[PDB]
Write a protein that binds this ligand. Sequence first.
Ligand SMILES: CC(C)(COP(=O)(O)OP(=O)(O)OC[C@H]1O[C@@H](n2cnc3c(N)ncnc32)[C@H](O)[C@@H]1OP(=O)(O)O)[C@@H](O)C(=O)NCCC(=O)NCCS
Ligand SMILES: CC(C)(COP(=O)(O)OP(=O)(O)OC[C@H]1O[C@@H](n2cnc3c(N)ncnc32)[C@H](O)[C@@H]1OP(=O)(O)O)[C@@H](O)C(=O)NCCC(=O)NCCS
Lengths: 137, 136
Amino acid sequence: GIIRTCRLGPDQVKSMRAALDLFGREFGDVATYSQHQPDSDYLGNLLRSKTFIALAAFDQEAVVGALAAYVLPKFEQPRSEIYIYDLAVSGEHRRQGIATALINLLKHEANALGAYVIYVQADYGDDPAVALYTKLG
Amino acid sequence: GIIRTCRLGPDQVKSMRAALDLFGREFGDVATYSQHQPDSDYLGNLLRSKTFIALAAFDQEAVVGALAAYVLPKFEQPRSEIYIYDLAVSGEHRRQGIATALINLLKHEANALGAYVIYVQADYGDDPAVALYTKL
Ligand SMILES: CC(C)(COP(=O)(O)OP(=O)(O)OC[C@H]1O[C@@H](n2cnc3c(N)ncnc32)[C@H](O)[C@@H]1OP(=O)(O)O)[C@@H](O)C(=O)NCCC(=O)NCCS
Ligand SMILES: CC(C)(COP(=O)(O)OP(=O)(O)OC[C@H]1O[C@@H](n2cnc3c(N)ncnc32)[C@H](O)[C@@H]1OP(=O)(O)O)[C@@H](O)C(=O)NCCC(=O)NCCS
């Protein structure tokens, strides 16, 4: 099959948008992730920052997995923490190690970035007004 | 005897440090918030950024309340969410409406920023590897 992963840059706004559509489909909320996407200048600036990380997995050059995380530059100490906000894999590519692959790339990014920890969603998904995270490390 | 609140700017690094010290005492972890604080260049830059908000409440010109929050520029839509990371009030100034006042100031900052929602870190405190947030 061959699934490739990479960190999206300001030059890959198109894949970023494709990753957003995947989020919409996997979360059962297409409107939220596909009908009100920000413009390209905004998406380009976001992907250009060092405190936001977008990871995508490709199958036949189509987005099949996406990971969106934020880097929190801390105030108490000169250190940073990563929080995986959204993570989803195509329903047709589950249990293949894709999310695992995105997270390993994320760890690669964290190390280069210097982040000392990574939090993930202690998901049940339903979480309307609640958002729990667990320490991946 | 009158509690004043305001958002800290790059020109108030000293108060930011005092707010940090406050977090250490009230959270029962002085070393983490007081022994390894970032240098002034770093605090200055953090305070000059628009995605970070530090609020402090004073009593006789001493920091007695502090609130540190991050603004997340969203990816699915051009909107932002605010997450209160740390919030604490002097142990000797509890139930005086200081947190409530810091929170109201935060809503003000959020509104001026356009943020459509604010979350607060679920506090049973103890939560080591489990950060939880609830909508405010
Ligand atoms: C949760 C989700 C992202 C996982 O995607 P995925 O690509 O199927 O996940 P993976 O195949 O990489 O790994 C799944 C499991 O198999 C395990 N695994 C990975 N590679 C493995 C291998 N080679 N051998 C054995 N087990 C393996 C992983 O540890 C994981 O176990 P765990 O969930 O108990 O921790 C996916 O189901 C999804 O998109 N769900 C909807 C959105 C959602 O709820 N997202 C929240 C994510 S925190
Ligand atoms: C929790 C804390 C910040 C509140 O201090 P405070 O300034 O005395 O609170 P206030 O006088 O403004 O308000 C009094 C009560 O109204 C409640 N309240 C006010 N606005 C509220 C809101 N929007 N949502 C929920 N509760 C609210 C508070 O929970 C508080 O009850 P409590 O003392 O049993 O916790 C303070 O006790 C503290 O510093 N605790 C240690 C650190 C901690 O637990 N931080 C987590 C904060 S979420």
